[PDB]
C-alpha cells in the first residue's frame, strides 16, 4: 500500500492566522490526492481533490498544492469552523489510503490546570469496588502527566485517562484520571494522592485526601 | 499497469470531451431530451419517444472489446429522459461478479 | 440533496458475521460508485472498500482482504458491506460514502456512520455513582461535582444535567474501555459553592441499549 504520513500531528494556530499542513506519500501519487476536514461528532468533509481543486462550497481561503510525494494544505486565515482534524488521501492506486490526520487546535497562552480529587462514594464501596477520580480542569496545552500513589505505593496500570475536546470559550482542555481499587484494598490504606505535572506549573502539584477525614 | 489515477484521469478527459461536444452542438428546434453526461456516457439530444444510443465510452479498460457496442436510453414523450439505461453491450467480456467475490 | 443513512450496526461476537446497509437518496444511485470507510473511537479514518457504479469491480483494504464483501442493489438504492470473521480491532464507526465518479476513488459525500462493536461482553446498564462536591473540588467561589457512569455495555450513553437546564461548563468525558470489556465514563460540571445548599444537581443518564434510565442526585457529603 501507498503509505500517507501527515505532519505535524497537532498544529497550534492563533485565530486569524495561517495554518500550513503537510502530507507525504511513500511513493509518487502524481496529483491524485484529496484533503478532508472532520469536526468531532461529525462526518468528514471533502475539501480538495486533484491536489489543488476545491470542492463545491469550499472558500478561497483553503488552498492545496503539491505533486508527486509532497503536498500542502493551507488555510490563509483560520475562522472558528477551521479548527478541526484534516486528512489527506491518495487515489493514485488501490487500495486507497488516508494519512494519519493533523489536528488544528486553537493556540493560547499557557494555563495551568485546577486539580480536584474525589474519593469513592459509600454506595460504590458497598458494591465491592472503589473508584478514585482526579480531575484536571481548563488547562493548556493538552500535554499533562498524572501519577497515582496509595500510601506512597506507585499505582501503575490500574488507572485510565480521558480528555475532552478543546473548549473554544477559553481554548482549554479538561482531563480525568480514574483509579480503580477493590473495596478491601481501599480500606487498607490512608493517603490517596494524584500528582500532576504540566507546563503551567513551576513544580508538580499534589492533590490528596486521607481516608476518614 | 492500470492504476486508479490513470483510469480516473481518462474518465475526466471523457467527461471534458462530452462538455465541449454538448457546448458546440446547437440545441434542436422542437421538443427533445437534453444532451447530457450521466457520469457514464455522453448522450446527444434525442427525439421524444425515440431510443437514444451512445457508443461505449473509450475510458473503459476493455474498450477495444466493446468498441462497436452502444448504451441505450429512452427519450420520453414529454422530452424527459427515462430512468432505464442498458449498457450490457459495453460490459467487460469476462464479467462474473460471483467469481469476482470468490 | 445527497442523503446516506447507514443501518445494521450493533454488537457482534468475535469471529461472527455482520452486514451493514446504506440507503441513498437525493441523487441517482446507479450513476455513482460508493465507498465504505471506518473510524475506530479516538482514531483516524481508515478506508475499507469501494465498488463501481455497476459492480464491475470491487476494491478492498489490506486489513479486510478475504473477510469483507461490498455489493449493491441499484433497484433498491442500497449499498451493502458483508463482514465475516470479525475481530475486536474491527470495532469502529462505519461510514457510507458516495464516490466522486463511477469507480470508487474519492468519497465526496459521507453518511453519519453506524457503530459496530466486536466483543463477547453482555449488554448491561451502568451503575451511576456521585462525584460529590467538597473542599477537594473547590476553587474560588465554585465547586466541581459530577457523576461516575460505570460498567455499561455497549456504547453509547448520554448524560444531561438537571433535565437539560444545566449545560455550560459540563465536561462529559469520552468513555474508556475497561479490562472487563465494560465501558465507564464521568461527567462533571462546575457550580457556585453558594448554590450547593438549595439548588439540586442531578445527572440524567440514558443507556438505550440496556433500557436503563437513571437520575442521580449529587450533593456534598456529611
Amino acid at each position: 500500500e501507498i503509505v500517507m504520513t501527515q505532519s505535524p500531528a497537532t498544529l497550534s494556530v492563533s485565530p486569524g492566522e495561517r495554518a500550513t499542513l503537510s502530507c507525504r506519500a511513500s511513493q509518487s501519487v502524481s496529483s491524485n490526492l484529496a484533503w478532508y476536514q472532520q469536526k468531532p461528532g461529525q462526518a468528514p468533509r471533502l475539501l480538495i481533490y486533484g491536489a489543488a481543486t476545491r470542492a463545491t462550497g469550499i472558500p478561497a481561503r483553503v488552498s492545496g498544492s503539491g505533486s508527486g510525494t509532497e503536498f500542502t494544505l493551507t488555510i490563509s486565515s483560520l475562522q472558528s469552523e477551521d479548527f478541526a482534524v484534516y486528512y489527506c488521501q491518495q487515489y493514485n492506486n488501490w487500495p486507497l489510503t488516508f494519512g494519519g490526520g493533523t489536528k488544528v487546535e486553537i493556540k493560547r497562552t499557557v494555563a495551568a490546570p485546577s486539580v480536584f480529587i474525589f474519593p469513592p462514594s459509600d454506595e460504590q464501596l458497598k458494591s465491592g469496588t472503589a473508584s478514585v477520580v482526579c480531575l484536571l480542569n481548563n488547562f493548556y496545552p493538552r500535554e499533562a502527566k498524572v501519577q497515582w500513589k496509595v500510601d506512597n505505593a506507585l499505582q501503575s496500570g490500574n488507572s485510565q485517562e480521558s480528555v475532552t475536546e478543546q473548549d473554544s470559550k477559553d481554548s482549554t482542555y479538561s482531563l480525568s484520571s480514574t483509579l480503580t481499587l477493590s473495596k478491601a484494598d481501599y480500606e487498607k490504606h490512608k493517603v490517596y494522592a494524584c500528582e500532576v505535572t504540566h507546563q503551567g506549573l513551576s513544580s508538580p502539584v499534589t492533590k490528596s485526601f486521607n481516608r476518614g477525614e | 499497469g492500470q492504476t486508479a489515477g490513470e483510469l480516473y484521469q481518462r474518465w475526466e478527459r471523457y467527461r471534458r470531451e462530452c462538455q465541449e461536444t454538448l457546448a458546440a452542438a446547437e440545441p434542436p428546434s422542437g421538443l427533445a431530451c437534453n444532451g447530457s453526461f450521466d457520469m457514464y456516457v455522453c448522450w446527444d439530444y434525442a427525439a421524444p419517444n425515440a431510443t437514444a444510443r451512445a457508443s461505449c465510452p473509450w475510458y473503459l479498460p476493455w474498450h477495444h472489446h466493446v468498441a462497436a457496442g452502444f448504451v441505450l436510453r429512452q427519450c420520453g414523450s414529454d422530452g424527459q429522459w427515462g430512468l432505464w439505461r442498458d449498457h450490457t453491450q459495453c460490459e467487460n467480456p469476462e464479467k462474473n461478479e460471483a467469481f469476482l467475490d470468490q | 440533496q445527497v442523503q446516506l443513512v447507514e443501518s445494521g450496526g450493533g454488537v457482534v461476537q468475535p469471529g461472527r458475521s455482520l452486514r451493514l446497509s446504506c440507503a441513498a437518496s437525493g441523487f441517482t444511485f446507479s450513476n455513482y460508485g460508493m465507498h465504505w470507510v471506518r473510524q475506530a473511537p479516538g482514531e483516524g479514518l481508515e478506508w475499507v472498500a469501494a465498488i463501481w457504479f455497476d459492480a464491475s469491480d470491487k476494491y478492498y483494504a489490506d486489513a479486510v482482504k478475504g473477510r469483507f464483501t461490498i455489493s449493491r442493489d441499484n433497484s433498491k438504492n442500497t449499498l451493502y458491506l458483508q463482514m465475516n470473521s470479525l475481530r475486536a480491532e474491527d470495532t469502529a464507526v462505519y461510514y457510507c460514502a458516495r464516490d466522486q465518479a463511477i469507480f470508487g476513488v474519492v468519497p465526496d459525500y459521507w453518511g453519519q456512520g453506524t457503530l459496530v462493536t466486536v466483543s463477547s461482553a453482555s449488554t448491561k446498564g451502568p451503575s451511576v455513582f456521585p462525584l460529590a462536591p467538597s473542599s477537594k473540588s473547590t476553587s474560588g467561589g465554585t465547586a466541581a461535582l459530577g457523576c461516575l457512569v460505570k460498567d455499561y455495555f455497549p456504547e453509547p450513553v448520554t448524560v444531561s444535567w438537571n433535565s437539560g437546564a444545566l449545560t455550560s461548563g459540563v465536561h462529559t468525558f469520552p468513555a474508556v474501555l475497561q479490562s472487563s470489556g465494560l465501558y465507564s465514563l464521568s461527567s462533571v460540571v462546575t457550580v457556585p459553592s453558594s448554590s450547593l445548599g438549595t439548588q439540586t444537581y442531578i445527572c440524567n443518564v440514558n443507556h438505550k441499549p440496556s433500557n436503563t434510565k437513571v437520575d442521580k442526585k449529587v450533593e456534598p457529603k456529611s
Side-chain angles (χ1 to χ4, degrees):
Chain A
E1 61 166 28
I2 298 182
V3 174
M4 312 301 304
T5 61
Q6 297 180 245
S7 64
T10 301
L11 187 64
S12 301
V13 190
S14 301
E17 281 304 280
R18 153 191 312 220
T20 302
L21 291 72
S22 293
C23 173
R24 160 170 264 121
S26 57
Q27 59 181 260
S28 179
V29 297
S30 184
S31 296
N32 304 311
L33 185 102
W35 288 89
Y36 300 88
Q37 178 193 77
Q38 184 182 32
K39 320 276 293 183
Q42 297 185 47
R45 178 52 206 118
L46 178 65
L47 306 178
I48 300 281
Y49 66 94
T53 301
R54 292 185 280 275
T56 312
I58 302 303
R61 65 183 191 262
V62 181
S63 60
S65 61
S67 64
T69 53
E70 284 281 2
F71 306 85
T72 297
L73 181 68
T74 297
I75 317 173
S76 55
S77 183
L78 294 197
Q79 306 185 2
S80 167
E81 45 270 32
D82 298 339
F83 295 95
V85 185
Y86 296 82
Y87 300 91
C88 61
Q89 174 242 327
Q90 65 84 18
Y91 50 100
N92 190 74
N93 202 13
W94 296 282
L96 315 178
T97 50
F98 284 93
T102 286
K103 164 180 160 198
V104 179
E105 60 155 17
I106 308 173
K107 169 194 287 306
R108 72 180 302 307
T109 54
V110 176
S114 298
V115 187
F116 310 120
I117 192 165
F118 297 91
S121 64
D122 293 326
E123 191 203 344
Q124 184 183 18
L125 292 182
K126 293 194 175 61
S127 71
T129 59
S131 295
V132 196
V133 176
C134 189
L135 175 62
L136 284 61
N137 238 9
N138 296 99
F139 61 94
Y140 184 90
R142 174 191 170 93
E143 286 70 37
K145 174 187 176 66
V146 182
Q147 283 194 337
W148 283 98
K149 276 180 177 289
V150 178
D151 280 344
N152 196 30
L154 178 58
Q155 302 298 300
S156 181
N158 59 349
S159 67
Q160 292 184 107
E161 275 175 8
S162 183
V163 193
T164 60
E165 299 285 348
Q166 190 181 34
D167 191 342
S168 71
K169 171 177 178 178
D170 52 16
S171 299
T172 66
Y173 298 86
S174 289
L175 180 150
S176 70
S177 178
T178 305
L179 179 74
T180 308
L181 312 193
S182 70
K183 180 197 199 301
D185 285 336
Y186 175 74
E187 296 181 330
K188 282 176 168 51
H189 299 103
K190 177 170 185 174
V191 182
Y192 293 83
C194 59
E195 188 199 51
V196 174
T197 70
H198 184 260
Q199 183 185 336
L201 303 167
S202 293
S203 67
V205 158
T206 300
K207 196 80 177 189
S208 69
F209 66 92
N210 295 338
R211 186 178 57 86
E213 287 186 358
Chain B
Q2 188 80 320
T3 60
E6 177 173 19
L7 176 57
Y8 195 17
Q9 233 160 345
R10 295 168 73 82
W11 175 91
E12 168 66 22
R13 185 166 180 179
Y14 179 92
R15 182 190 73 109
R16 185 48 185 252
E17 296 169 355
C18 183
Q19 298 188 22
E20 301 167 347
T21 301
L22 293 174
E26 50 149 40
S29 307
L31 191 71
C33 295
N34 61 312
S36 48
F37 177 64
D38 64 8
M39 302 299 290
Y40 176 67
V41 80
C42 203
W43 295 104
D44 213 312
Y45 291 94
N49 271 99
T51 298
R53 73 179 196 189
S55 292
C56 296
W58 58 262
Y59 61 76
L60 296 175
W62 58 87
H63 170 254
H64 40 281
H65 303 140
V66 293
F70 292 98
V71 192
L72 304 179
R73 190 189 281 275
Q74 292 242 54
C75 177
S77 52
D78 65 345
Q80 298 301 308
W81 290 105
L83 301 192
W84 164 86
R85 180 184 59 193
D86 191 312
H87 68 283
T88 56
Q89 296 179 34
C90 305
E91 301 199 305
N92 176 21
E94 309 172 309
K95 283 240 162 89
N96 180 205
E97 182 178 349
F99 156 81
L100 160 67
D101 291 342
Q102 192 183 276
Chain C
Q1 196 246 359
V2 178
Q3 181 176 339
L4 302 167
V5 0
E6 298 89 344
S7 300
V11 177
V12 57
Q13 294 176 350
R16 296 286 184 187
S17 299
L18 191 77
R19 171 169 47 258
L20 309 173
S21 54
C22 172
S25 68
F27 68 100
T28 303
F29 185 66
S30 302
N31 291 348
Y32 292 84
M34 299 293 294
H35 298 258
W36 286 101
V37 186
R38 72 187 180 177
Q39 186 170 34
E43 311 256 64
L45 301 172
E46 184 181 23
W47 185 74
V48 180
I51 184 175
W52 280 46
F53 78 109
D54 65 342
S56 290
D57 207 350
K58 301 168 185 184
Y59 312 100
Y60 300 91
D62 293 344
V64 309
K65 173 190 184 180
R67 296 189 300 145
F68 291 9
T69 297
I70 188 176
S71 60
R72 60 191 300 164
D73 188 338
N74 288 341
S75 58
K76 300 184 319 220
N77 300 316
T78 306
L79 175 75
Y80 300 103
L81 182 63
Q82 170 70 27
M83 296 184 295
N84 301 322
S85 297
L86 285 167
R87 300 185 284 267
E89 60 268 25
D90 295 313
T91 297
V93 172
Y94 282 76
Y95 288 100
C96 172
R98 187 193 81 178
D99 189 48
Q100 192 173 62
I102 58 180
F103 314 109
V105 285
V106 177
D108 67 341
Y109 296 104
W110 303 51
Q112 291 294 96
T114 184
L115 181 63
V116 173
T117 307
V118 186
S119 169
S120 303
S122 297
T123 298
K124 176 189 178 301
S127 295
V128 185
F129 301 115
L131 293 166
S134 78
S135 60
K136 297 301 178 178
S137 71
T138 304
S139 177
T142 73
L145 60 90
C147 279
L148 176 59
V149 180
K150 183 179 171 57
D151 294 335
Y152 68 90
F153 179 88
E155 288 270 60
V157 292
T158 58
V159 179
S160 62
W161 284 89
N162 292 355
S163 299
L166 177 60
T167 191
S168 51
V170 175
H171 296 309
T172 300
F173 296 91
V176 296
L177 180 58
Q178 297 167 124
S179 58
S180 59
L182 307 179
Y183 294 87
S184 171
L185 66 76
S186 290
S187 179
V188 299
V189 60
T190 299
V191 145
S193 301
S194 58
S195 70
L196 289 181
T198 53
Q199 174 61 59
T200 62
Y201 289 108
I202 294 174
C203 70
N204 320 109
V205 181
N206 183 23
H207 183 242
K208 188 177 181 179
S210 65
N211 191 37
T212 300
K213 277 201 182 81
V214 173
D215 292 335
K216 182 70 185 184
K217 184 184 182 185
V218 183
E219 61 183 339
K221 203 200 199 156
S222 170

